[PDB]
Amino acid sequence: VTRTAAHTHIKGLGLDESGVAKRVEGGFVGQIEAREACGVIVDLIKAKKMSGRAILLAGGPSTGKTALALAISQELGPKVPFCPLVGSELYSVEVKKTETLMENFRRAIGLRIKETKEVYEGEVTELTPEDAENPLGGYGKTISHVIVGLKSAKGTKTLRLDPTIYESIQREKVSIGDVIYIEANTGAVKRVGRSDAYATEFDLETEEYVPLPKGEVHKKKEIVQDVTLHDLDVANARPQGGQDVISMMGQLLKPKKTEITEKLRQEVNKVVAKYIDQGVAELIPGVLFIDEVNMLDIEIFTYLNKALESNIAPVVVLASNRGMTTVRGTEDVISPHGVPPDLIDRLLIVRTLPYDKDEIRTIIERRATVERLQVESSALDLLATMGTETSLRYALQLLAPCGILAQTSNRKEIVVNDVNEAKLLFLDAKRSTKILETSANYL
Amino acid sequence: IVQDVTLHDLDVANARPQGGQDVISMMGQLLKPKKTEITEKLRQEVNKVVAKYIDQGVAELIPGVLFIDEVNMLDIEIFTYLNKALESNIAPVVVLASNRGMTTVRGTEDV
Amino acid sequence: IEIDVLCDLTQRQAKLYQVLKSQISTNYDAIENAATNDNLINAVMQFRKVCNHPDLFERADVDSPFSFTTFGKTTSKFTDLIYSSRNPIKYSLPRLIYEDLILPNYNNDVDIANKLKNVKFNIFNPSTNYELCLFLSKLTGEPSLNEFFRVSTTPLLKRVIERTNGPKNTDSLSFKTITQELLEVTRNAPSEGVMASLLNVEKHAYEREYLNCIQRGYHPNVSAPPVTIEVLGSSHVTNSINNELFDPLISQALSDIPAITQYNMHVKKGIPVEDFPKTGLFPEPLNKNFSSNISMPSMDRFITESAKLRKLDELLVKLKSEGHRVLIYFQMTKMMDLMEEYLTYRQYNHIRLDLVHDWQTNPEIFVFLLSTNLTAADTVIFYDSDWNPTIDSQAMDRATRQVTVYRLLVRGTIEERM
Amino acid sequence: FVKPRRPYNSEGMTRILRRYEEDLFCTF
Amino acid sequence: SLIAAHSHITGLGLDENLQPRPTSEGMVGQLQARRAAGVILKMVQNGTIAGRAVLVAGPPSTGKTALAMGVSQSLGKDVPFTAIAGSEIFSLELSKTEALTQAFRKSIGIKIKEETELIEGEVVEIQIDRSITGGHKQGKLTIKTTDMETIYELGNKMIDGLTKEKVLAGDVISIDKASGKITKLGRSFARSRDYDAMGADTRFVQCPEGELQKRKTVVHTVSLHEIDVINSRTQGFLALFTGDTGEIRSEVRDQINTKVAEWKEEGKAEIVPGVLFIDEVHMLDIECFSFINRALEDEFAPIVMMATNRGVSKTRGTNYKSPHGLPLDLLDRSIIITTKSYNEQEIKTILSIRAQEEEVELSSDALDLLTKTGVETSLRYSSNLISVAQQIAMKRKNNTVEVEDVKRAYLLFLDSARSVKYVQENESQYIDDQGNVQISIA
Amino acid sequence: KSLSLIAAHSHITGLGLDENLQPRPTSEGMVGQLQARRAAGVILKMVQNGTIAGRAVLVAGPPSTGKTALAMGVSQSLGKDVPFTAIAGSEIFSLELSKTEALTQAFRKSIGIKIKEETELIEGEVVEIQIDRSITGGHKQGKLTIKTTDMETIYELGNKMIDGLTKEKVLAGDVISIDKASGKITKLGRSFARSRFVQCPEGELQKRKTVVHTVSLHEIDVINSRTQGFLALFTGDTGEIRSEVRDQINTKVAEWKEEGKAEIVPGVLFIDEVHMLDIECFSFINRALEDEFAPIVMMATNRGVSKTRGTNYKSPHGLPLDLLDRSIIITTKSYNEQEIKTILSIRAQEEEVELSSDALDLLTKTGVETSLRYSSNLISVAQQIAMKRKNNTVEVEDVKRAYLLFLDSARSVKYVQENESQYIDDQGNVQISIAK
Numbered sequence A: 001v002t003r004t005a006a007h008t009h010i011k012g013l014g015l016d017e018s019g020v021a022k023r024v025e026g027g028f029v030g031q032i033e034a035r036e037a038c039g040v041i042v043d044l045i046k047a048k049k050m051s052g053r054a055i056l057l058a059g060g061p062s063t064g065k066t067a068l069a070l071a072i073s074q075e076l077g078p079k080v081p082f083c084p085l086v087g088s089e090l091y092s093v094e095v096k097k098t099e100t101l102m103e104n105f106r107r108a109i110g111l112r113i114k115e116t117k118e119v120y121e122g123e124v125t126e127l128t129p130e131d132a133e134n135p136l137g138g139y140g141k142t143i144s145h146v147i148v149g150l151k152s153a154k155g156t157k158t159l160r161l162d163p164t165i166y167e168s169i170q171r172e173k174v175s176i177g178d179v180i181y182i183e184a185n186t187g188a189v190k191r192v193g194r195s196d197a198y199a200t201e202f203d204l205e206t207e208e209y210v211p212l213p214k215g216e217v218h219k220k221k222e223i224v225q226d227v228t229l230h231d232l233d234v235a236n237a238r239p240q241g242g243q244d245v246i247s248m249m250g251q252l253l254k255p256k257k258t259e260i261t262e263k264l265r266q267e268v269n270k271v272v273a274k275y276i277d278q279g280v281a282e283l284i285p286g287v288l289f290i291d292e293v294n295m296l297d298i299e300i301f302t303y304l305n306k307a308l309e310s311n312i313a314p315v316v317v318l319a320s321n322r323g324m325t326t327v328r329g330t331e332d333v334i335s336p337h338g339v340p341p342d343l344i345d346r347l348l349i350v351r352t353l354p355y356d357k358d359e360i361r362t363i364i365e366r367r368a369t370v371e372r373l374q375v376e377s378s379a380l381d382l383l384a385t386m387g388t389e390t391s392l393r394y395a396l397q398l399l400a401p402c403g404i405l406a407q408t409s410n411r412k413e414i415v416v417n418d419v420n421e422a423k424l425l426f427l428d429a430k431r432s433t434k435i436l437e438t439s440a441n442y443l
Numbered sequence B: 001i002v003q004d005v006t007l008h009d010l011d012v013a014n015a016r017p018q019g020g021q022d023v024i025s026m027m028g029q030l031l032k033p034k035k036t037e038i039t040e041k042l043r044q045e046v047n048k049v050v051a052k053y054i055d056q057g058v059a060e061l062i063p064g065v066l067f068i069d070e071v072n073m074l075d076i077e078i079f080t081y082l083n084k085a086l087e088s089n090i091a092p093v094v095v096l097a098s099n100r101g102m103t104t105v106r107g108t109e110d111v
Numbered sequence C: 001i002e003i004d005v006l007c008d009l010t011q012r013q014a015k016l017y018q019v020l021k022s023q024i025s026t027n028y029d030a031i032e033n034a035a036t037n038d039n040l041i042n043a044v045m046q047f048r049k050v051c052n053h054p055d056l057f058e059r060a061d062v063d064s065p066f067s068f069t070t071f072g073k074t075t076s077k078f079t080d081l082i083y084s085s086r087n088p089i090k091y092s093l094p095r096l097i098y099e100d101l102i103l104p105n106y107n108n109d110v111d112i113a114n115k116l117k118n119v120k121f122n123i124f125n126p127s128t129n130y131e132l133c134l135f136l137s138k139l140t141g142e143p144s145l146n147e148f149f150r151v152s153t154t155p156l157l158k159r160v161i162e163r164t165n166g167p168k169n170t171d172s173l174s175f176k177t178i179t180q181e182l183l184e185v186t187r188n189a190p191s192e193g194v195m196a197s198l199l200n201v202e203k204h205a206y207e208r209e210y211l212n213c214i215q216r217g218y219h220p221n222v223s224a225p226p227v228t229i230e231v232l233g234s235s236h237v238t239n240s241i242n243n244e245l246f247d248p249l250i251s252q253a254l255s256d257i258p259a260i261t262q263y264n265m266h267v268k269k270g271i272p273v274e275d276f277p278k279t280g281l282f283p284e285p286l287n288k289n290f291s292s293n294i295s296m297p298s299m300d301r302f303i304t305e306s307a308k309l310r311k312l313d314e315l316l317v318k319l320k321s322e323g324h325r326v327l328i329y330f331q332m333t334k335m336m337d338l339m340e341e342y343l344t345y346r347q348y349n350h351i352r353l354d355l356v357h358d359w360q361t362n363p364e365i366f367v368f369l370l371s372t373n374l375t376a377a378d379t380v381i382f383y384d385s386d387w388n389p390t391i392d393s394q395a396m397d398r399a400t401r402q403v404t405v406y407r408l409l410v411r412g413t414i415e416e417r418m
Numbered sequence D: 001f002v003k004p005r006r007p008y009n010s011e012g013m014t015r016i017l018r019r020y021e022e023d024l025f026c027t028f
Numbered sequence E: 001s002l003i004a005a006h007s008h009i010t011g012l013g014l015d016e017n018l019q020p021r022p023t024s025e026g027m028v029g030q031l032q033a034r035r036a037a038g039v040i041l042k043m044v045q046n047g048t049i050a051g052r053a054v055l056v057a058g059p060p061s062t063g064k065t066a067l068a069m070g071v072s073q074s075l076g077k078d079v080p081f082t083a084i085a086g087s088e089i090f091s092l093e094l095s096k097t098e099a100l101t102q103a104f105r106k107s108i109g110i111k112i113k114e115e116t117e118l119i120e121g122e123v124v125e126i127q128i129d130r131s132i133t134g135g136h137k138q139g140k141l142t143i144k145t146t147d148m149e150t151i152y153e154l155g156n157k158m159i160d161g162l163t164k165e166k167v168l169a170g171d172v173i174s175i176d177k178a179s180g181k182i183t184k185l186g187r188s189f190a191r192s193r194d195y196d197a198m199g200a201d202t203r204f205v206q207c208p209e210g211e212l213q214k215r216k217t218v219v220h221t222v223s224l225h226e227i228d229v230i231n232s233r234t235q236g237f238l239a240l241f242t243g244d245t246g247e248i249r250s251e252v253r254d255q256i257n258t259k260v261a262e263w264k265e266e267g268k269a270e271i272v273p274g275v276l277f278i279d280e281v282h283m284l285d286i287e288c289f290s291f292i293n294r295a296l297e298d299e300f301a302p303i304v305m306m307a308t309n310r311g312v313s314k315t316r317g318t319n320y321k322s323p324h325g326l327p328l329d330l331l332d333r334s335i336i337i338t339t340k341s342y343n344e345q346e347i348k349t350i351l352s353i354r355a356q357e358e359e360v361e362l363s364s365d366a367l368d369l370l371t372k373t374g375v376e377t378s379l380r381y382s383s384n385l386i387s388v389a390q391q392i393a394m395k396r397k398n399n400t401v402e403v404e405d406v407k408r409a410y411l412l413f414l415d416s417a418r419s420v421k422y423v424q425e426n427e428s429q430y431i432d433d434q435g436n437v438q439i440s441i442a
Numbered sequence F: 001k002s003l004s005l006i007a008a009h010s011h012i013t014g015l016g017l018d019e020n021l022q023p024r025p026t027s028e029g030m031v032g033q034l035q036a037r038r039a040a041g042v043i044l045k046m047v048q049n050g051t052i053a054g055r056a057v058l059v060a061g062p063p064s065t066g067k068t069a070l071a072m073g074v075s076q077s078l079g080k081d082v083p084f085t086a087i088a089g090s091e092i093f094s095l096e097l098s099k100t101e102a103l104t105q106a107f108r109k110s111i112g113i114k115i116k117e118e119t120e121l122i123e124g125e126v127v128e129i130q131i132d133r134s135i136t137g138g139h140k141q142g143k144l145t146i147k148t149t150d151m152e153t154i155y156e157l158g159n160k161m162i163d164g165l166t167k168e169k170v171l172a173g174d175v176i177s178i179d180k181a182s183g184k185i186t187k188l189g190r191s192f193a194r195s196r197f198v199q200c201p202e203g204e205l206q207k208r209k210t211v212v213h214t215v216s217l218h219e220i221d222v223i224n225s226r227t228q229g230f231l232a233l234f235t236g237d238t239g240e241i242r243s244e245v246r247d248q249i250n251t252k253v254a255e256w257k258e259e260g261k262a263e264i265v266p267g268v269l270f271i272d273e274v275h276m277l278d279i280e281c282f283s284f285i286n287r288a289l290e291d292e293f294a295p296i297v298m299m300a301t302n303r304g305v306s307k308t309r310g311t312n313y314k315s316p317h318g319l320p321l322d323l324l325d326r327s328i329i330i331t332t333k334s335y336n337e338q339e340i341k342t343i344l345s346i347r348a349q350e351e352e353v354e355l356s357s358d359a360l361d362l363l364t365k366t367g368v369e370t371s372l373r374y375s376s377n378l379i380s381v382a383q384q385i386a387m388k389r390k391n392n393t394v395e396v397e398d399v400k401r402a403y404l405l406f407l408d409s410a411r412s413v414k415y416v417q418e419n420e421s422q423y424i425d426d427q428g429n430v431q432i433s434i435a436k
């Protein structure tokens, strides 16, 4: 019916009203102290007062760190921007890694603006241009004005345009009998389609037929928009949207990441603060999630040390499964979790714990009931012993071949023999390594 | 009229957009012609239209020889892509030459 | 006959549900407890508003990018509509820098150095370097020896606009490549030719996968004009900026001339076609849908965004084919207006708001809408189903044949508990 | 009733007529 | 056509109970790997789960790529099967993570339902109105069948499709509205007064009778990555063929995911996931593995098949050694299908099948000696020797390869063991690793 | 203006100093470090005098001793209209600029030019607007009535004013600003007339107003180079500006200062984590400091005797000796118990958290024991645990709960070191299975 991939049995942290975690809630089993710390972090993010707060999720493999970050994102809701990221994303061939890090920092901060739009709309009735007295004079264009007559439901207006709006109108390929949509903030024109007041069965252009827009021609409507700061920076650095030749030639060029200067960021911040002071916009800070943080270089960590001290920084969540490991880009610096000691001071470490046999068994139970499979009790005990013997994940993804082998025998029951066949057909890391050691030519 | 072209000419003719009035095409005509990574999709369509006109009895396919001399200087990534690309249906016969004995492959420290 | 219909949440409905769940600090247990019991009532009214129809909680409107502009707006026989969009970011420049570095005057040497570096010491000048010009003319085949001095001293955009396909002499060193004589054959070649079809892979892939009927999936979030530069007290800066932003050659090149205006040039004024400012250089978009960033509220997404409404649109076809008279029970008047506009879109026979007399006398009607006395009444649907049996019993015996009662249910919500 | 057709608006424009027996080309 | 390396494998050779036949469908032997591949094939065909990594491991010349080709041929049509190598990720204009993201998104197909209208009939009158320059184009078309005759309106693209592929009155054309394609089926009027400008010999077709306008429902499969490239910029359809898609932003991918879910929620489109095959996966940086470990956990993720012929070797980007050249985090989330070496009867059957595909009539003793030299040396050498033995055999003008031609081909062309034997006793003739060589023969 | 949630250095409003440059024990959010604050006050006086150029100082000490706090104090004590550029050591490693070019741009961004100009402006509230058209509409006549709180006048309009008023609609009762020489008219808002909302202007209507401009050398460098416009100041692709335009800018600025049309305002460039620069960057920095238009460079580092980048030897502070020869070094020291508790009380006041005395004592004890930043992070996370139990004051139990939930450096190393079979080591070995 649905599609499932390694998650989506997790619906949140599953806490109480006081911050106490239940044993089985939200698809989580165990990890009580980590879930309580994550709930405190969720409350801190929802307070909307702090800047540049960093936590680190430190534990072994298959202990539930990405699951906890997903639960953080699900608990915060879709209004708060969440930016998932791996450590290998920051190495770009178009721009330096520092700019990619700052771009993700500004992408993790949201905004909510209520915008007023001046709108002309209607069905085009009369489209008559007027000519210039000397059109080959070198300066000045061919026409002078274009008269456009629009009609609506209980309304009809005639507009006199300068040529610049008419160039967009002509680029939209409008004619007489079309319903158009002119917005006055940027001069953009949208052509909706043919009016339904004429015949609709004599075309060959697979176009749809709309009726007349209700209300008057000239309106002022309120639109609530959700944007980020990186959208404002990107729109200002590569300007498209005007009707000047720089804007029209900006759309035709191939896009490329540039190094956005700090001056543009300060001016965008000043404009956003002026919008907030007018009661128009509101600020929604969010979370940046960086997975496999040990893949970063020493330069990226050194820039993070300065980027966390800014006054507009979001909450940063990191995760790593490393012990005493040399930092990449250095040769002798041995540090906990592969993170240098200058960053650990600005951090709050949340420690995750390994599981038990019963926790493995019930995690396999929820993963079986999410994938729409039913197993026997003895097969479940075999899977739990198998998960303790080899890995939790190997017991997790052996469920689907067992289900396929159960289906191919015309049964809707997973039994011990299907699990034995799945063992015989698929190996794990330990048995493959044991085959590799006792091999002739790297078998 | 009997005309002879190679498949690479067909690839670079089909990749280059047909001459229109847009500013981008004539701009790229007036600028330095930088090479681009031709996708496998375009080569696939070129192969199907070539096989379609071969089946009509009009065109004829002439495979040739790619002679790479002193192949000791190739990196191991190119060797692995040679292993991949020798299994294609449209591949020609490739001739290699080398004058080394027991030597390490470039890019590897112990092979 | 009592049967309930189960519906599954849509993407917008689930997004609004998750926003409402995260907004109220996750006291969902209290919401469920006081839902079993029946200012929490104002909290659960938002939830029932979300599962009823997403437009009641927040109306869908025109989806357009945010305009980062400060234009001339109205603080409310023709009306003038002039382009006036600016950028909110203002870059201020002193007059001294402009007047002493960029404009010529008596105390600087902008024009003198420009002439010295561009005319007198240019190596393509035929008055001083005629041998190089003759060498290049033998190399390329240009009929004029001033072509290189003209190419080297005009910008690339001005070169690529006014480029002409002038002829060149055969006695030169520049001949035609193989790729060019392949491409020049198929300029006006028709289909079914072997050479024409072998060089037309892209258009065949365009019409093989139906690319002129696909929909646009992405539009940008913010659109902005270029940053305004302000100099206080100088009209020359304004003139130069207006000339750069709205260059008549370039803006004329990126669009067309009206056809009746072209008729006024050619016939009523005697201007030849070769003297026209050349036009039509803007690239064609992929579809008609890709030509702008503004998307419209369509009356096909309105059906699919509400799951209960889509299940009614699935269910009314059988009742219309079987020829019945349906009646809907509601609780608000907002969805009375919503079903008014939906039924006028679907052009069905319904009431305009005596009712019993019009119900008995007229059988041409189809669907009745009431807000909490019929007999020829066969199929009844509970949209906003509440299991308080006092209302359901009086609704049941308010309205000969077999009677089927229907209830719409949304999976994974309050109503599955209810 | 029958809906009217869309108005056809071609002044100052050429014409190519391709009939059964004979073809035209009107120029300005 | 032409003969490839795995041209004899079209399918997997499995029964209805997923049990392999000993010799079927071009595949012989390797029962456990074929059964596991059939299980993975049904896992793909169900389409209910996403982001599962499968590793195929074993010695060289064992049938890993043969297994991948059997899976691809049993997959069937309109299911994406992206086959890449590990060396293609490193590019000068794309990051490794961006190239891996594009390779992931190539393997997810979207099947879009479309509603078209087909129009066929004789053309009565074409009127085309154009500007003086030629930009604005409009006109009317009068098409006609035996029973009906209507007048249509034309646009710029329709007039462009009418002008090229020249249509006159009396020709029979077929128009598809949603694709914008005009095909000329022939001519029926046979006009007497023909201006002798062209050498047209158009076909005589009959009058189409019945309804002029017919509706039909068409289905086409597009990839996800094609939708990102199309929506990325203004001329992305050119970038689909030139490959100039440089680092598509994340906002495009988010909005495309949202619109794909919206199209699924209405019934216009459905998601058909596919198989991404990575041959020589050990030829990858550790940053690629770290990206793969978290890109396997997304909703839009295909089933990834990887092949390795490497033991405990060095992992690239690091300074330690790992099993299969892969880190243990990637090996944690993978199930492993192992492959075992062949017997003499399996090698004989392989050589007989490859001789049947290449159309070579081998003798019995020639087959026995080819099996002997394929069990002492490798299988690929004895497979390569067959065409050379055939080309030697046609020099004597007999169409049957004897043991003499096989012996001659074995004499003329060398194996790896004979090559290292010849090199290791003449080390002065070849260039040393220190660059020393002896060129003079005295 | 200047939106900000709460910064980590948000309590520092400058250097707490007397009129004789003596540091008070607690002033302007800075406590302790008397000698370092006195040295930074001397450097501040060096910047404010403006008669010397190209002096580099170095702020070196142990980590978490207030070096960035000192830099923020100097930057806040400079105030506005004086350039202050703060960069990191890893910022200059660009893919489109060379390292010396990025260092040159950062050098010229820190010196500005003060230009004073005056313009004549119109400000008032629109009373009534008449536009007249003829029979053919070829010419347009107009009258505008505009008033302030002191006078009222009527103006006769020409064609371009009428076109500039029809564009960007102006109605009655609007407060507008008109520039005559450039033709730019801005709507300030709407007047307070019920019958946005600003007040009616006062005084004269024709005002000559003086605006003091400050423009850096890098901006004039970008504009004077013809290879890109002023939009490269925002897009950020200037692309290796040539040297000759910089000598032209230098000579033009020198003769502008000679004529009296401009003044030179030098500033401070701050390089945080200076040890991450290559030796080529250090060698460029050595010779870039003897220029006449060079700012005062502040460098901060916390390393001991470590390896210089790009070399194979070790140097004090990570910097070569020829760079250290031209530097004067300010040394910061570690903190006491009382300084730590005063820092924590100030961070409590800035975070709007009310603390008990016992909670403050426990935070001081665990800050002396572990780290200052660890307690300064624990204090804000304890308030949410306190607010979950619905009380305002943060008690000892909330601090102990936050200390249990969130670990520090030494404890995390301790739990790692006896569980290293479950973590991935330097050799890539790990044990995931529970048993065996």
Ligand SMILES: Nc1ncnc2c1ncn2[C@@H]1O[C@H](COP(=O)(O)OP(=O)(O)O)[C@@H](O)[C@H]1O
Pocket (backbone or CB within 6 Å): A006, A007, A027, A028, A029, A030, A031, A060, A061, A062, A063, A064, A065, A066, A067, A068, A321, A363, A392
């Ligand atoms: N407490 C838990 N309850 C249910 N499932 C869990 C729990 N912890 C981990 N899992 C499952 O185990 C797997 C661990 O994956 P992940 O968290 O990404 O790795 P890591 O633990 O190294 O971060 C996931 O598939 C997750 O669904």
Ligand SMILES: Nc1ncnc2c1ncn2[C@@H]1O[C@H](COP(=O)(O)OP(=O)(O)O)[C@@H](O)[C@H]1O
Pocket (backbone or CB within 6 Å): E005, E006, E009, E026, E027, E028, E029, E030, E059, E060, E061, E062, E063, E064, E065, E066, E067, E307, E309, E350, E379
């Ligand atoms: N079971 C089989 N059926 C058919 N052909 C096979 C089989 N096993 C091996 N082959 C042939 O042997 C060769 C094996 O090489 P390949 O599969 O490319 O590499 P590897 O075996 O190392 O994965 C292929 O050319 C294939 O045609």
Ligand SMILES: Nc1ncnc2c1ncn2[C@@H]1O[C@H](COP(=O)(O)OP(=O)(O)O)[C@@H](O)[C@H]1O
Pocket (backbone or CB within 6 Å): F008, F009, F029, F030, F031, F032, F033, F062, F063, F064, F065, F066, F067, F068, F069, F070, F302, F343, F372, F373
């Ligand atoms: N003398 C001081 N007065 C006030 N706050 C201080 C002082 N010294 C350090 N701090 C505070 O301690 C925190 C960490 O010090 P910081 O300056 O980041 O250390 P470093 O000097 O290593 O960069 C900062 O938030 C800073 O405000």
